[PDB]
Design a protein around this motif. Structure first.
Motif, short mmCIF file in Angstrom:
data_model
loop_
_atom_site.label_atom_id
_atom_site.label_comp_id
_atom_site.label_asym_id
_atom_site.label_seq_id
_atom_site.Cartn_x
_atom_site.Cartn_y
_atom_site.Cartn_z
N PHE A 61 0.83 -1.20 0.00
CA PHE A 61 0.00 0.00 0.00
C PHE A 61 0.87 1.26 0.00
CE2 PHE A 61 0.80 0.19 4.58
CZ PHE A 61 0.91 1.56 4.76
N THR A 62 0.44 2.26 -0.75
CA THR A 62 1.17 3.52 -0.84
C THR A 62 0.24 4.71 -0.66
OG1 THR A 62 1.03 3.22 -3.26
CG2 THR A 62 3.17 2.82 -2.21
N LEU A 63 0.81 5.91 -0.70
CA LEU A 63 0.04 7.14 -0.54
C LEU A 63 0.48 8.20 -1.54
CD1 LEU A 63 0.37 7.03 3.30
CD2 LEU A 63 -1.86 6.97 2.17
N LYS A 64 -0.30 9.27 -1.64
CA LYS A 64 0.02 10.36 -2.56
C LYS A 64 -0.50 11.69 -2.01
CE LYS A 64 -2.36 9.37 -6.33
NZ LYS A 64 -2.73 9.80 -7.71
N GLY A 65 0.03 12.79 -2.55
CA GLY A 65 -0.39 14.11 -2.10
C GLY A 65 0.22 14.49 -0.77
N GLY A 66 -0.60 15.02 0.13
CA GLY A 66 -0.12 15.42 1.44
C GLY A 66 -0.03 16.92 1.58
N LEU A 67 0.00 17.39 2.83
CA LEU A 67 0.09 18.82 3.10
C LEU A 67 1.10 19.50 2.18
CD1 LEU A 67 2.50 20.52 4.56
CD2 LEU A 67 2.24 18.75 6.31
N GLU A 68 2.14 18.75 1.81
CA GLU A 68 3.18 19.28 0.93
C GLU A 68 2.57 19.94 -0.30
OE1 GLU A 68 6.01 19.99 1.61
OE2 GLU A 68 7.60 18.99 0.46
N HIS A 69 1.72 19.20 -1.00
CA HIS A 69 1.07 19.71 -2.20
C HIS A 69 -0.37 20.13 -1.90
CE1 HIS A 69 3.75 17.99 -5.67
NE2 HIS A 69 4.36 18.91 -4.94
N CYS A 70 -0.67 20.29 -0.62
CA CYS A 70 -2.01 20.69 -0.20
C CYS A 70 -3.05 19.66 -0.62
CB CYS A 70 -2.37 22.06 -0.79
SG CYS A 70 -1.54 23.45 0.01
N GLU A 71 -2.65 18.39 -0.62
CA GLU A 71 -3.54 17.30 -1.01
C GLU A 71 -3.81 16.38 0.18
OE1 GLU A 71 -3.07 14.99 -4.54
OE2 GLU A 71 -2.34 16.70 -5.71
N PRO A 72 -5.04 15.86 0.25
CA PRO A 72 -5.46 14.95 1.33
C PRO A 72 -4.79 13.59 1.22
CG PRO A 72 -7.18 15.12 -0.32
CD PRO A 72 -6.13 16.13 -0.70
N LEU A 73 -3.67 13.43 1.92
CA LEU A 73 -2.93 12.17 1.90
C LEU A 73 -3.89 10.98 1.89
CD1 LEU A 73 0.16 11.76 1.88
CD2 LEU A 73 -0.03 11.05 4.27
N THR A 74 -4.12 10.41 0.71
CA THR A 74 -5.01 9.27 0.56
C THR A 74 -4.36 8.17 -0.27
OG1 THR A 74 -6.10 10.49 -1.25
CG2 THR A 74 -7.21 10.44 0.89
N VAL A 75 -4.66 6.92 0.07
CA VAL A 75 -4.11 5.78 -0.64
C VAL A 75 -4.03 6.06 -2.14
CG1 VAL A 75 -4.39 3.35 -1.22
CG2 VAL A 75 -5.00 4.17 1.07
N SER A 76 -2.85 5.82 -2.72
CA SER A 76 -2.64 6.05 -4.14
C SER A 76 -2.57 4.73 -4.90
CB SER A 76 -1.36 6.85 -4.37
OG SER A 76 -0.23 5.99 -4.44
N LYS A 77 -2.00 3.72 -4.26
CA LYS A 77 -1.87 2.40 -4.87
C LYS A 77 -1.77 1.31 -3.81
CE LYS A 77 -0.34 -0.77 -7.92
NZ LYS A 77 -1.25 -1.76 -8.54
N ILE A 78 -2.38 0.16 -4.08
CA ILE A 78 -2.35 -0.95 -3.15
C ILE A 78 -2.20 -2.28 -3.88
CG2 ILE A 78 -3.60 -2.21 -1.36
CD1 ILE A 78 -5.05 0.36 -0.68
N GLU A 79 -1.01 -2.87 -3.79
CA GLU A 79 -0.74 -4.15 -4.44
C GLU A 79 -1.90 -5.12 -4.25
OE1 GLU A 79 3.19 -5.46 -5.17
OE2 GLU A 79 3.93 -4.53 -3.32
N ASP A 80 -2.45 -5.59 -5.36
CA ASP A 80 -3.57 -6.53 -5.31
C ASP A 80 -3.07 -7.96 -5.11
OD1 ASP A 80 -6.17 -5.08 -5.79
OD2 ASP A 80 -5.04 -4.35 -7.53
N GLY A 81 -3.00 -8.38 -3.85
CA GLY A 81 -2.54 -9.72 -3.54
C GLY A 81 -1.67 -9.77 -2.30
N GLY A 82 -1.17 -8.61 -1.89
CA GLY A 82 -0.32 -8.54 -0.71
C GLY A 82 -1.12 -8.64 0.58
N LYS A 83 -0.74 -7.84 1.57
CA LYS A 83 -1.42 -7.84 2.86
C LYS A 83 -2.52 -6.78 2.89
CE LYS A 83 0.48 -10.16 5.83
NZ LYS A 83 0.59 -11.61 6.16
N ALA A 84 -2.16 -5.55 2.53
CA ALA A 84 -3.12 -4.46 2.52
C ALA A 84 -4.40 -4.86 1.79
CB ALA A 84 -2.51 -3.23 1.86
N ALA A 85 -4.26 -5.35 0.56
CA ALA A 85 -5.40 -5.77 -0.23
C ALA A 85 -6.13 -6.93 0.42
CB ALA A 85 -4.96 -6.14 -1.64
N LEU A 86 -5.37 -7.93 0.86
CA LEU A 86 -5.94 -9.10 1.51
C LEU A 86 -6.84 -8.70 2.67
CD1 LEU A 86 -3.09 -11.78 1.57
CD2 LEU A 86 -5.35 -11.98 0.52
N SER A 87 -6.47 -7.62 3.35
CA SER A 87 -7.25 -7.13 4.49
C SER A 87 -8.64 -6.70 4.05
CB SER A 87 -6.53 -5.96 5.16
OG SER A 87 -5.25 -6.34 5.63
N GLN A 88 -8.74 -6.18 2.83
CA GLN A 88 -10.02 -5.73 2.29
C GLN A 88 -10.67 -4.71 3.22
OE1 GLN A 88 -12.13 -9.40 1.77
NE2 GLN A 88 -11.19 -9.86 -0.22
#
Length: 100
Positions: free
Chosen positions: A25-52
């Motif tokens: 799982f990864t993120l994008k944006g952030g206060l840096e670019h004045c963006e709401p740090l929200t999940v940008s990508k999540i490997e489909d098959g790892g742990k993050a995704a498996l958690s659903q």
């Protein structure tokens, strides 16, 4: 009499992982670019995704129990050194069926 109605509801979904990184799982944006740090990508098959529990579009403000301040680095970094278990809390501004 004057227009004034409150309708600010949010749901915190605590994504508790288990097994140890990599999670996928990864993120994008952030206060840096004045963006709401929200999940940008999540490997489909790892742990993050498996958690659903989370998905590209959620806002992570708590990593491993550490309350972030919008920043990104500190966030992604907090993961690099994760543990056998990961604790994250994403907030989703559910909307649609609600009038207002």
């Amino acid at each position: 009499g004057s227009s004034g109605s409150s309708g600010g509801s949010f749901q915190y979904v605590p994504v508790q992982l288990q097994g140890g990184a990599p999670w996928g799982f990864t993120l994008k944006g952030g206060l840096e670019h004045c963006e709401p740090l929200t999940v940008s990508k999540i490997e489909d098959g790892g742990k993050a995704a498996l958690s659903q529990k989370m998905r590209t579009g959620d806002e992570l403000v708590n990593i491993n129990g550490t309350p972030l301040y919008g920043s990104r680095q500190e966030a992604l970094i907090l993961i690099k050194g994760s543990f056998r278990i990961l604790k994250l809390i994403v907030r989703r501004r559910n909307s649609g069926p609600s009038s207002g």
